[PDB]
Amino acid sequence: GNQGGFGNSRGGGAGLGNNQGSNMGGGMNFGAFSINPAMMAAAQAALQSSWGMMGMLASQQN
Amino acid sequence: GNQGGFGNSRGGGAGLGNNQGSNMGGGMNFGAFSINPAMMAAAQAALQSSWGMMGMLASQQN
Amino acid sequence: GNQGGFGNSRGGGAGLGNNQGSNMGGGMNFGAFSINPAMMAAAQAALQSSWGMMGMLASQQN
Amino acid sequence: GNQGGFGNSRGGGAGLGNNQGSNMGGGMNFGAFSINPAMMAAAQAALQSSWGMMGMLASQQN
Amino acid sequence: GNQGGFGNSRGGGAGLGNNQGSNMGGGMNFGAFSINPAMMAAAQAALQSSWGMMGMLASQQN
Amino acid sequence: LDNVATYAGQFNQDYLSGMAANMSGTFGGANMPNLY
Amino acid sequence: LDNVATYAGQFNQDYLSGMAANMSGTFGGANMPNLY
Amino acid sequence: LDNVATYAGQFNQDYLSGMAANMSGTFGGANMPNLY
Amino acid sequence: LDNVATYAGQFNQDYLSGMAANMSGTFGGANMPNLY
Amino acid sequence: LDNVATYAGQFNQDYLSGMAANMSGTFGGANMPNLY
């Protein structure tokens, strides 16, 4: 009779899992307006490489 | 009688799984307006490489 | 009598699976207005490479 | 008597599977207005390569 | 009869899992308007490398 | 002599109150992915 | 002699009150991913 | 002789009251990821 | 002789009361990630 | 002879009352991450 969490979010990533007894359980959760190269692996050997990322990423309220 | 979470989201990625007893269970969950090269592997060896990513990523409210 | 999660989303990707006892169970879930080259593999060896991605990715509300 | 999740989505990709006991079960689920070259493989060796992707990806509300 | 947390968020990433008895359970949770190359691994050996990241990241309220 | 080029010219856009995207891109090519 | 180039020229944009993106990009190419 | 270049020229933008992005980028290329 | 370059020129922006981003970037390339 | 460079030139910005970002960056490249 286990369960997770309870709530609300706006904009951002939210994790509300039941993760009891796991090895890194929960997920990869990302927010709006973003740049995000991503990798998930179960292996003997693993390598990630990334370069050259440009953005404005701005907000105006009138 | 296990279960996951409960909630609401706007814009962003949301993980509400039942992940009990797993090895990295939960998913890869992404938000709106984005750039996201992605990889998921179960292997002896694994490599990811990425370059040259440009965006505005902006908001105006009048 | 296990089950997953419960909820609502707008814009973003949402994972609500029953993932109990899995190896990386849950799915790859993506949001609206995006660029996302993607790969899922079960193999002895695996490689991903990507370059040159441009977008505006903007919103105006009047 | 296992089952998956319960919910609603608008715009984005949604995963609600019963994935209990699987190896990466859940699917690849994508949202509206997007560019997404995609690959799923079970093999001894696997390679993906992609370049040159341009879009506006914008919204106006009057 | 264990469960997670309860609350509200705006902008930022929020973790409300039931993580009892886990090895690093909880998820990776990210906020809006950002640059975030990310990696999650269970392996004998693992390496991440990243360079060249530029943004404005600004807000104006009138 | 081997050339790949893009030429885009004069944008005239006074009194803009909506949304415009002026995007120019060039991509060289003699790429070779190999899998043995 | 081997050339890859982009030329984008004059933006005229007085009294701007909406949103504009002027984006120019160039990407060399003789890349070679290998998997043995 | 081997060239990769970008040329972007004159931005005229008096009395700006909205949002503008003037972005120029250049990326060399003869990259080689290998997995043995 | 091997060149990678960016040239961005004259920004004219009097009486600015909104938001502007003037961004120029250059990235060399003959990178080689290896996994044995 | 091997060159990586950025040239950004004249910013004219009198009577500024909003927000401006003038950003120039250069990144050399023949990097080699190895995992044996």
Curated annotation (Swiss-Prot), chains A, B, C, D, E:
Residues annotated as carrying Phosphoserine in the record are 9
Q: Where is the composition biased (Gly residues)?
A: 1-20
The post-translation modification note in this UniProt entry reads:
Hyperphosphorylated in hippocampus, neocortex, and spinal cord from individuals affected with ALS and FTLDU. Phosphorylated upon cellular stress.
The listed locations are: Nucleus; Cytoplasm; Cytoplasm, Stress granule; Mitochondrion
Query: How is the subunit organization of this protein annotated in UniProt?
Result: Homodimer. Homooligomer (via its N-terminal domain). Interacts with BRDT. Binds specifically to pyrimidine-rich motifs of TAR DNA and to single stranded TG repeated sequences. Binds to RNA, specifically to UG repeated sequences with a minimum of six contiguous repeats. Interacts with ATXN2; the interaction is RNA-dependent. Interacts with MATR3. Interacts with UBQLN2. Interacts with HNRNPA2B1. Interacts with ZNF106. Interacts with CNOT7/CAF1. Interacts with CRY2.
Q: What is known of its domains?
A: Consists of an N-terminal domain (NTD) and two tandem RNA recognition motifs, RRM1 and RRM2, followed by a C-terminal glycine-rich region.
Record-given protein name: TAR DNA-binding protein 43
- Which organism is this protein's natural source? Homo sapiens
Say which residues of the entire protein are included here: 284 to 345 of 414
Swiss-Prot record, chains F, G, H, I, J:
Please indicate which superkingdom the organism of origin belongs to: Eukaryota
Protein's cellular compartments: Cytoplasm; Melanosome; Nucleus envelope; Nucleus, Nucleoplasm
Summarizing the annotation, the consequence of altering residue 2 to G is:
In ALS23; forms cytoplasmic aggregates in patient tissues; no effect on nuclear and cytoplasmic localization; loss of interaction with S100A6
**Comment text on domains:** A pair of annexin repeats may form one binding site for calcium and phospholipid.
Q: Which family does it belong to?
A: Belongs to the annexin family.
Subunit organization? Interacts with S100A6. Interacts with PDCD6 in a calcium-dependent manner. Interacts with KIF23 during cytokinesis.
Q: What does this protein do?
A: Binds specifically to calcyclin in a calcium-dependent manner. Required for midbody formation and completion of the terminal phase of cytokinesis.
Q: Which disease is it linked to?
A: Amyotrophic lateral sclerosis 23: A form of amyotrophic lateral sclerosis, a neurodegenerative disorder affecting upper motor neurons in the brain and lower motor neurons in the brain stem and spinal cord, resulting in fatal paralysis. Sensory abnormalities are absent. The pathologic hallmarks of the disease include pallor of the corticospinal tract due to loss of motor neurons, presence of ubiquitin-positive inclusions within surviving motor neurons, and deposition of pathologic aggregates.
Under what name is this protein listed?
Annexin A11
According to its UniProt entry, this protein's organism is: Homo sapiens (Human)
Gene name linked to the record: ANXA11
Mapped onto the parent protein, the portion here is 39 to 74 of 505
